[PDB]
């Protein structure tokens, strides 16, 4: 007996949404780890910290909107463990930005695969949901991180003593 | 070479704080799961949903304050996987409240063990931190959940058709 | 079957809290008696009256916070008779202040014994409660009464005709 | 040597006023006990709690106005022990309301006896005081408690699971 | 004959409080010296000056609260000479920050010893006072100085010509 | 190599300014000691306390303006120990006022000697500085203390029981 609300919602889509929820919660956790790296006494870049904390909270938002979608369409949320990030020590502001850029591209690829599945299953509601709330958000995020990586590289991060300090106070501040 | 800030901070305390961070993030995840259970089309108790979502966000706050403490004292945050909750289907408003009460008592026991360790290691800063921000918060939470469980039981939840509906709109609304 | 909320709360602590509730209600009654002594036609020191009435209402506050604590921790309030004060006729403003100082020191000693018991029973929540809401309040009260006793003594109370009158209007007014 | 203010004030009236002061303080204590019964984790009817706490504070007001009267007329306040209430466990919202109704009728009977004594002693000031501040207050209180008892009985308290809960939130809230 | 207010206050605690008052006044003097070093014509880092002047005034606050505590508990303040700071010429912004960090750790160690003494003498009021007003303040101060030292080191202070100038205007400004 | 700013500033003036800085810090410490004497439980003259605390803070101001002058003129501040006051127990309000008057006259004599030195060294900037900020301030302070001493003497301090009490509340309040 399916949910009384379910219509045109393929089980494969339901499962792929559960996988995406986990990936968004994972991304939130990565950014939380980065936020607290930058508030270490031996790093102390408070605007890098604030930037990644904000990104962490945005990813939780991305997870919740997918959870809401699952309920709206009559699917059933199935949560899984949230894996720990690949590092606790993120090495530098530049390295954290590079890792965030890679993460965002990986999440983007997942979203594009989800869109292809929704298209294959003739689910225009799901296609529109991804286009409206996810795909452009990802493109903007990737572009912003690319901008930040370029400036940090050009400024001489991480080894040039003034580079991350000045980027912290003038770009992220 | 210890952190330049570290003073009177035992490695066992540092490790126990890392364990507590994981437990608080776990509690956040349990409450997030409960929040979205109550917005299922076949449950649809929107104030139970809002109540647990608020609890979820409070637990993230508890995790972050411990992460901040670790940095302030010169310890190093070590994150671990956040285990999935024990259930996706929380059965009823009463059952969710009972599970939350058990969770809060378990977290409390962990905090009391942490306080005993801090006392044993002569760390009054850590003892005060737990007393100021954690122990009374836990006592208030446990009491509130106890109140809610009692009322739901007396009203005839979960089988009495009006009980969870009326509790949703008059206690949690 | 203990309360569903009870945790780390020793029966000896529960009983000592009941004893403390009675002592706070007793102190409220002593100060109420003093308040109405000072509004006798043959005493007529209206600011001494107001001062002790305020102290009486504060002690009721101290009793209620302990009653709340008992409920929060899952103990059961057990009330006893509130003994009448040792006098109806408090003799003078100076004598009332001296009696209040002795009362406050006695209540303080009780609170210190309660703190020692809570420490012995490894109850940091109860220890913190006493430190946060009781111990400093007592130290401030004892100091204030000491100040008042000194000034009244130096001014020549109770026999110097102007002393209590002027203290009433310039310190307590 | 009587008070310089005393006039037309019989010793029997003075003594009966002292007895009434004790009865009003007793009633305050009964209602304080009831207030904290309703905030137990296994009762948790917060508007019953608030209702009885308010009644407790009103009774203290009734005691103080009699204490003031004693001073105004030149009598001497004589305080006695405040007996503990007959119960700590008040069983149910309905039972507490029934006990409060009985208490109010008993206090009323005492006030009517005091009025009869004042009449016998030709004390119109005391008669007017009781009529102005006590007798109608009692009639209103008894009527209100009667209303509450009737509704709770009709609703099926204490055994009907929704009755006290709904009365708490819709009459007392 | 002890003070009329004194209770549960050991002579060893009284003496240790006098020693702590002197140490706080000493710390105030060190920071005053640093403040005026940075306004020399050949140093001229006005935000380093303002930062240390603020720290100096905070230490006077720490001294006064201990002086107040001594009076509140019935001890007797015993002042001693305030020793001059170890240097008049503080060499650089980085060196001043390093010296301040060492000073704060030394004051912290003193406060931890005072807390251990208060614990040994069963003085929970004094323990709470130190925890409430001193211990967390010290942890925050040490962390802040650690952050500042790290940034100055990374930026290339004191020899890199732009480092202290830019830190002055962007962190301390 | 002198400071790039130094002009018409004799080494003897520089040294005399350092001596004056120490004397102003000493005066601050004397008044701080007096302030806390008057808040003892066995003295308890809160407006004497406030009066001397204000004087203490003014003396710190006098010290800082001389420190600023030293920097402005290109001299080098040389701090010395701040000697403890001659007493901890200041005996009475009258005695404290007499001691403050003597202190102010001594500081005045020092300032007059500094002015004579500045005149001898043809330093009109330093002469003007002392005249503008110090000499009239001292004359006003000495006059005020003289007024206070006279009133306290006439009122019968320290032995007349009402004198210091009434002066506290009507002159210093
Ligand atoms: Cl479907
Ligand atoms: Cl997994
Ligand atoms: Cl489609
Ligand atoms: Cl350590
Ligand atoms: Cl794991
Ligand atoms: Cl400790
Ligand atoms: Cl227990
Ligand atoms: Cl008894
Ligand atoms: Cl403990
Ligand atoms: Cl009469
Ligand atoms: Cl009796
Ligand atoms: Cl009549
Ligand atoms: Cl003692
Ligand atoms: Cl010394
Ligand atoms: Cl202790
Ligand atoms: Cl020169
Ligand atoms: Cl010296
Ligand atoms: Cl000249
Ligand atoms: Fe973003
Ligand atoms: Fe955002
Ligand atoms: Fe995302
Ligand atoms: Fe793993
Ligand atoms: Fe993202
Ligand atoms: Fe984004
Ligand atoms: Fe909560
Ligand atoms: Fe909240
Ligand atoms: Fe928590
Ligand atoms: Fe698992
Ligand atoms: Fe919790
Ligand atoms: Fe403690
Ligand atoms: Fe909570
Ligand atoms: Fe008070
Ligand atoms: Fe108050
Ligand atoms: Fe009290
Ligand atoms: Fe008795
Ligand atoms: Fe008290
Ligand atoms: Fe505390
Ligand atoms: Fe008090
Ligand atoms: Fe009423
Ligand atoms: Fe009312
Ligand atoms: Fe009444
Ligand atoms: Fe009895
Ligand atoms: Fe009544
Ligand atoms: Fe009549
Ligand atoms: Fe009438
Ligand atoms: Fe009433
Ligand atoms: Fe500071
Ligand atoms: Fe500050
Ligand atoms: Fe300090
Ligand atoms: Fe020396
Ligand atoms: Fe400090
Ligand atoms: Fe600080
Ligand atoms: Fe002045
Ligand atoms: Fe001033
Ligand atoms: Fe001066
Ligand atoms: Fe000396
Ligand atoms: Fe002066
Ligand atoms: Fe002055
Ligand atoms: Mg995955
Ligand atoms: Mg931050
Ligand atoms: Mg764990
Ligand atoms: Mg909702
Ligand atoms: Mg007792
Ligand atoms: Mg009055
Ligand atoms: Mg009776
Ligand atoms: Mg309540
Ligand atoms: Mg020392
Ligand atoms: Mg400046
Ligand atoms: Mg000198
Ligand atoms: Mg004061």
Q: Does the beta-carbon distance from A81 to B80 stay under 8 Å? A: no
Structure tokens at F14: 């520089």
Q: Do chain E and chain F touch with ≥3 beta carbon pairs under 8 Å?
A: yes
Q: Which two tokens stand for residue B59?
A: 């637990």
F8: left (phi over 0), alpha (psi -120 to 50) or beta: left
Size of interface B-C (CB pairs under 8 A): 42
A6 Rama sector, left if φ>0, alpha if ψ -120 to 50, beta otherwise: beta
d(CA D17, CA D34): 26
Contact call for A165 and E143, based on CB within 8 A: no
- Say if the Cβ atoms of E132 and B129 lie within 8 Å: no
C158 preceded by cis ω (within 30°)?
A: yes
Collapsing DSSP states into helix, strand and coil, what is residue E82? strand
What is the separation of C-alpha E128 from the centre of its chain, rounded to a whole number of angstroms? 19
Q: What token pair was written down for B120?
A: 């044993």
> Which residue of chain C has the CA closest to F46?
C147
Binding-site residues on chain A for chain B (CB distance < 8 A): 3-5, 29, 33, 36-37, 39-42, 67-68, 70-71, 74, 76-85, 88-89
Of how many residues is chain D composed? 173
Neighbours of E120 (CB within 10 A): 11
Q: Name the residue among E27, E26, E52 with its Cα closest to residue E39.
A: E52
| Positive or negative torsion for Cα F118, F119, F120, F122 | positive
Token couple for E107? 């004051």
Taking Cα atoms as reference points, which of D134, D120, D135 lies closest to residue D13? D120
Burial class (CB in 10 A: 0-12, 13-18, 19+), B80: middle
Annotated binding site of A for Fe cation: 24, 59, 62, 104, 138
Neighbours of D56 (CB within 10 A): 21
Contacts of E128 (CB under 8 A, 6+ apart): C131, C132, C135, C136
Q: Is C138 annotated in some ligand binding site?
A: yes
Minimal Cα distance from B164: which residue of D? D162
- State residue E82 phi and psi, 5-degree precision: -95, 110
Residue E135 to residue B122, Cβ atoms within 8 A: no
Q: How far is CA D40 from CA C67, D44, D85, D87, F162, in A?
A: 10, 6, 17, 15, 54
Q: In the 3-class helix/strand/coil scheme, how is chain A assigned residue by residue? A: CCCCCCCCCCHHHHHHHHHHHHHHHHHHHHHHHHHHHCCCCCCCCHHHHHHHHHHHHHHHHHHHHHHHHHHHHCCCCCCCCECCCCCCCCCCHHHHHHHHHHHHHHHHHHHHHHHHHHHHCCCHHHHHHHHHHHHHHHHHHHHHHHHHHHHHHHHCCCCCCCHHHHHHHHCCC
Q: How far is CA E17 from the centre of its chain?
A: 15
Evaluated on CA atoms B152, B155, B156, B162, the torsion sign reads negative
The full length of chain F comes to 173
What are the structural domain ranges in chain B?
11-171
Enumerate residues 6+ apart whose C-beta is below 8 A from B16.
B113, B114, B117
For residue B155, count other CB atoms closer than 10 A to its CB: 24
CB contact under 8 A, E88 and F78: yes
- Chains touching E by CB (3 or more pairs below 8 Å): A, B, C, F
CA–CA distance, F51 with F39 (Å, rounded to integer): 12
User: Length of chain A, please?
Assistant: 173
- Which residues of chain E have a Cβ shorter than 8 Å from any chain B Cβ? 101, 105, 108-109, 112, 115-116, 119, 127, 130-132, 135-136, 139-140, 142-143, 145-146, 149-150
C-alpha E139/C-alpha C68 separation (Å) is: 33
List the single residue in D41, D164, D166 with the smallest CB-CB distance to B146.
Answer: D41
User: Which residues are found with C-beta within 5 Å of the ion, ligand 27?
Assistant: B 24, 59, 62
Distance CA A49, CA A39 (A): 6
DSSP string, E45-73: -HHHHHHHHHHHHHHHHHHHHHHHHHHHH
Determine the straight-line distance between the first and last CA of chain E, rounded to whole angstroms: 54
Per the CB < 8 A criterion, the answer to whether A21 and A77 are in contact is yes
Three-state secondary structure call for residue C105:
helix
Tell how far the Cα of A46 is from the centroid of ligand 10, in angstroms. 80
- What would the two tokens of residue F170 be? 């009507």
Question: What is d(CA E102, CA A62) in angstroms, rounded to the nearest whole number?
Answer: 46
Contact B93, B158 (CB under 8 A): yes
Contact B8 E112 (CB under 8 A): yes
Cα–Cα distance, C33 to C28 (Å, whole number): 9
Contact B114, B17 (CB under 8 A): yes
Which chain D residue's Cα is nearest to B152? D161
Cis peptide before B158 (omega within 30 of 0): yes
Which tokens go with D135?
């007798």
CA distance B33 to B24: 14
Q: Cβ-count burial of B137 within 10 angstroms (0-12 exposed, 13-18 middle, 19+ buried)?
A: middle
Question: Which of C4, C127, C129 is closest, CB to CB, to B146?
Answer: C4
Q: Do residues B73 and B4 make contact, with C-beta atoms less than 8 angstroms apart?
A: no
Asked if F93 and F149 count as a contact pair (C-beta separation under 8 A), the reply is no
Place of tokens 């303002």: E50
DSSP state of C82: B
Check if the beta carbon of residue F69 is closer than 8 Å to that of residue F129: yes
E108:B3 CB<8 A: no
Show binding-site residues of F for Fe cation.
24, 59, 62, 104, 138
Q: Which two tokens stand for residue A92?
A: 């530098």
Choose the mutation target among B120, B124, B126, B127 for the interface with E, i.e. most E CBs under 10 Å: B124
Nearest to E3 by CA among A119, A86, C145, D168: C145
CA C54 to ligand 33 centroid distance, Å: 6
Q: Which CATH code is given to the segment(s) A11-171? A: 1.20.1260.10
Q: Across the interface, which of E71, E122, E128 has its CB nearest the CB of C135?
A: E128
d(Cα A119, Cα C155) in Å, to the nearest integer?
Answer: 94
DSSP helix/strand/coil, F82:
strand
- With a CB cutoff of 8 Å and minimum separation 6, the contacts of F160 are none
Whether the CB-CB separation of B124 and E136 falls below 8 Å is answered with: no
* Tokens matching residue F114: 């500094």
CA angle D69, D74, D80 (to 5 degrees): 65
What CA–CA distance (Å, rounded) separates B141 from A6?
37
8 Å CB contact between C35 and C85: no
**Spatial distance between the Cα atoms of E13 and F96, rounded to a whole number of angstroms:** 28
Signed CA dihedral, D64, D70, D72, D76: sign only: negative
In angstroms, how far apart are the furthest CA atoms of chain C?
64
**Technique used by the depositors:** X-ray
> Which of F39, F44, F45 is the mutation pick for testing C, counting most C CBs within 10 A?
F44
**Distance (Å, whole) CA D49 – CA D82:** 22
Shortest CA gap B144–chain C (Å): 9
Q: Are the beta carbons of F165 and C166 separated by less than 8 Å?
A: yes
- The contacts of residue F58 (CB under 8 Å, 6+ apart) are none
Residue given tokens 């400004």 in the structure block = E173
Residues of B in contact with C3 (CB under 8 A): 146
Nearest to D131 by CA among D108, D148, D152, D160: D108
Min distance F138 CA to chain C CA atoms (Å): 32
The span from the CA of F38 to the CA of F30, in Å, is 13
D44 φ, ψ to 5°?
55, 50
Closest residue by Cα to residue E85 from E33, E145, E142, E21: E33
- Helix axis angle for E93-120 and E46-73, nearest 10°, is 10
DSSP secondary structure, B39-84, as one string: TSTTT--HHHHHHHHHHHHHHHHHHHHHHHHHHHHT-------BPP
Distance CA D94, CA D151 (A): 9
Question: What single DSSP character describes residue F32?
Answer: H
Give backbone dihedrals phi and psi of A70, rounded to 5 degrees, phi first: -55, -50
Residues C17, C71: contact at Cβ < 8 Å?
Answer: no
Distances in Å between the alpha carbon of D108 and those of D101, D104, D138? 10, 6, 6
Rounded Cα distance between E157 and E166, Å, is: 10
- Count CB-CB contacts under 10 A for residue D86: 10
User: Cβ contact (<8 Å) for E77 and F85?
Assistant: no
Tokens encoding F126: 């330093």
Cβ neighbours of residue D124 under 8 Å, at least 6 residues apart?
Answer: none
Nearest CA among E96, E82, E105, E117 for reference residue E167: E96
Of B109, B116, B135, the CB nearest to C125: B135
Instruction: Classify residue E13 as exposed, middle or buried by CB count within 10 Å of its CB (0-12, 13-18, 19+).
Output: buried
Other residues' Cβ atoms within 10 Å of the Cβ of residue A72: 14
Query: How far does the CA of residue D23 sit from the closest CA of chain B (Å)?
Result: 33
How far, rounded to the nearest angstrom, does the alpha carbon of residue F77 sit from its chain's CA centroid? 19
Nearest by Cα to B75 from E153, E143, A84, E151: E143
Compute the distance between CA of residue C41 and CA of residue D1 in angstroms, rounded to an integer.
14
Interchain pair A82, B77: CB under 8 A: no
Buried b (16+ CB within 10 A) or exposed e, C4-43: bbebbbbeebbebbbebbbbbbbbbbbbbbbbbbbbbeeb
CA E34 to chain centre: 13
Give C83's contacts in chain D (Cβ within 8 Å).
Answer: 81
Taking the CA of residue E148 and the nearest CA in chain A, the distance in Å comes to: 8
Q: Angle at the Cα of C41 (from C38 to C42), degrees rounded to 5?
A: 80
Residue B82, φ and ψ in degrees, nearest 5? -95, 110
E82 contacts E26 by C-beta, under 8 angstroms: yes
The Cα angle at residue C14 between residues C13 and C17, in degrees rounded to 5: 85
Q: What is the DSSP string of C157-169?
A: TTTSTTHHHHHHH
Backbone phi and psi for residue A82, each to the nearest 5 degrees, phi listed first: -95, 110
How many angstroms separate the CA atoms of B137 and B117, rounded? 20
CA angle C28, F40, E126 (to 5 degrees): 70
Q: Looking at chain C, how many residues does it have?
A: 173
Distance (Å) from CA D38 to ligand 66 centroid: 8
Residues B61, B56: Cα–Cα separation, whole Å: 9
- Number of neighbouring beta carbons within 10 Å of residue B118: 25
Residue B59 labelled as part of a binding site: yes
Cβ atoms E156, A161 nearer than 8 A: yes
Ion ligand 34 residue ranges (Cβ < 5 Å): C 24, 59, 62
Q: How many CA atoms lie within 13 A of E143 on its CB side?
A: 18
CA atoms within 13 A on the CB side of F18: 16
For B115-121, the CB contacts below 8 A with 24+ separation are B115/C124, B116/C122, B117/B12, B117/B13, B117/B16, B118/B13, B119/C124, B121/B10, B121/B12, B121/B13
Q: In degrees to the nearest 10, what's the CA dihedral of F52, F58, F64, F70?
A: -110
**C-alpha to C-alpha distances, C157 to B145, C63, C91, nearest whole angstrom:** 56, 33, 11
**Tokens 């508007």 map to which residue?**
D47
Q: Is the peptide bond before E158 cis (omega within 30 degrees of 0)?
A: yes
Burial class (CB in 10 A: 0-12, 13-18, 19+), E2: exposed
Q: Give C96's Cβ-side CA count (13 Å radius).
A: 25
CB–CB contact B125 E139 (8 Å): yes
Contact D80, D155 (CB under 8 A): no
Q: How far apart are CA E150 and CA E104, in angstroms?
A: 16
Burial of D170 (0-12, 13-18, 19+ CB in 10 A): exposed
Nearby residues of A46 by Cβ (< 8 Å), 6 or more positions away = A38, A39, A168
* CB-based burial label for A84 (10 Å; 0-12, 13-18, 19+): middle
Any idea what the Cα angle at residue F37 is, between residues F32 and F41, rounded to 5°? Answer: 140
- Which DSSP symbol is given to C86? S
Cis peptide before F66 (omega within 30 of 0): no
Per DSSP (E only), the strands in chain B are: none
Q: Do chains B and A touch (3 or more CB pairs under 8 A)?
A: yes
Phi, psi of E40, rounded to the nearest 5 degrees: -65, 150
Report which of E78, E80, E73, E79 is spatially closest to residue E10, judged by C-alpha positions.
E73
Tell me the residues of E at the F interface, defined by beta carbons under 8 Å apart: 3-5, 29, 33, 36-37, 39-42, 67-68, 70-71, 74, 76-85, 88-89
CA–CA min distance E122, chain C (Å): 8
CA–chain centroid gap for E22, Å, is 11
CB A96, CB A56: distance < 8 Å: no
Q: What is the DSSP letter of D135?
A: I
Neighbours of C54 (CB within 10 A): 11
Adjacent-strand bridge partners of D103: none
**Count of C-beta atoms within a 10 Å radius of residue B91:** 13
């Amino acid at each position: 007996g399916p949910s009384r609300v379910r219509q045109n919602f393929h089980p494969d889509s339901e499962a792929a949404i559960n996988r995406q929820i986990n990936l968004e919660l994972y991304a939130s956790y990565v950014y939380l780890s980065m936020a607290y790296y930058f508030s270490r006494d031996d790093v102390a870049l408070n605007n890098f910290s604030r930037y990644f904390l904000h990104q962490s909270r945005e990813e939780t938002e991305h997870a919740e909107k997918l959870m809401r979608l699952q309920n709206q369409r009559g699917g059933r949320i199935r949560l899984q463990d949230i894996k720990k990030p690949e590092q606790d020590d993120w090495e530098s502001g530049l390295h954290a930005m590079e890792c965030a850029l890679l993460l965002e591209k990986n999440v983007n690829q997942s979203l594009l695969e989800l869109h292809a599945l929704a298209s294959d299953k003739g689910d225009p509601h799901l296609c529109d949901f991804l286009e409206t709330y996810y795909l452009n958000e990802q493109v903007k995020s990737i572009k912003e991180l690319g901008d930040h990586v370029h400036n940090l590289v050009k400024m001489g991060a991480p080894d040039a003593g003034l580079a991350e300090y000045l980027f912290d106070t003038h770009t992220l501040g």
